[PDB]
Amino acid sequence: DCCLGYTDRILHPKFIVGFTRQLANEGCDINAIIFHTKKKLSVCANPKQTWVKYIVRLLSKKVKN
Amino acid sequence: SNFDCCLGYTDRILHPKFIVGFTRQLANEGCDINAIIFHTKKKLSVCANPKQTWVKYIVRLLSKKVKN
Numbered sequence: 001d002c003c004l005g006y007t008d009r010i011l012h013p014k015f016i017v018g019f020t021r022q023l024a025n026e027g028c029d030i031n032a033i034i035f036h037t038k039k040k041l042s043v044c045a046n047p048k049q050t051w052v053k054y055i056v057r058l059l060s061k062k063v064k065n
Numbered sequence: 066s067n068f069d070c071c072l073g074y075t076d077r078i079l080h081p082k083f084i085v086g087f088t089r090q091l092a093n094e095g096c097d098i099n100a101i102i103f104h105t106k107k108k109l110s111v112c113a114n115p116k117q118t119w120v121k122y123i124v125r126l127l128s129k130k131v132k133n
């Protein structure tokens with residue numbers, strides 16, 4: 001459903017297969033990055049955190065290449 | 066469980082404003098072809114060709130939005 005809290009975890013860049021962005025803007029109350037992982041589970045993350053931004057850029061660069 | 070594979074690419078062109086995320090399918094992780102799977106809020110995803118400029122663009126746009 002909507003993320004209400006953010007993980008304390010710091011994910012490995014190779015453990016994620018993608019992500020979704022949740023905006024306070026659409027149905028949910030807060031903004032979140034939802035990482036989709038190789039365990040076919042999703043992890044809710046703080047959009048402002050340096051690791052979250054970094055993983056997302058590593059993934060999109062991989063696609064660019 | 067195993068990831069259900071895209072076996073081919075959509076012809077549809079979805080406006081990027083409806084795309085809320087993506088997952089990348091890699092042939093080197095077991096499926097037969099590479100794909101980008103675009104997610105929408107209505108939980109209907111579409112399978113896209115990673116080689117296409119349009120596809121790489123939308124993916125980069127999604128990341129730049131996260132950057133801020």
Ligand SMILES: O=S([O-])[O-]
Binds near residue numbers: 062063064090
């Ligand atoms: O298949 S990756 O390069 O999007």
Ligand SMILES: O=S([O-])[O-]
Binds near residue numbers: 075
């Ligand atoms: O449906 S499209 O935007 O690959």
Ligand SMILES: O=S([O-])[O-]
Binds near residue numbers: 092094
């Ligand atoms: O999720 S895998 O098949 O790249």
Ligand SMILES: O=S([O-])[O-]
Binds near residue numbers: 093094095096097
């Ligand atoms: O595992 S696949 O790339 O034939």
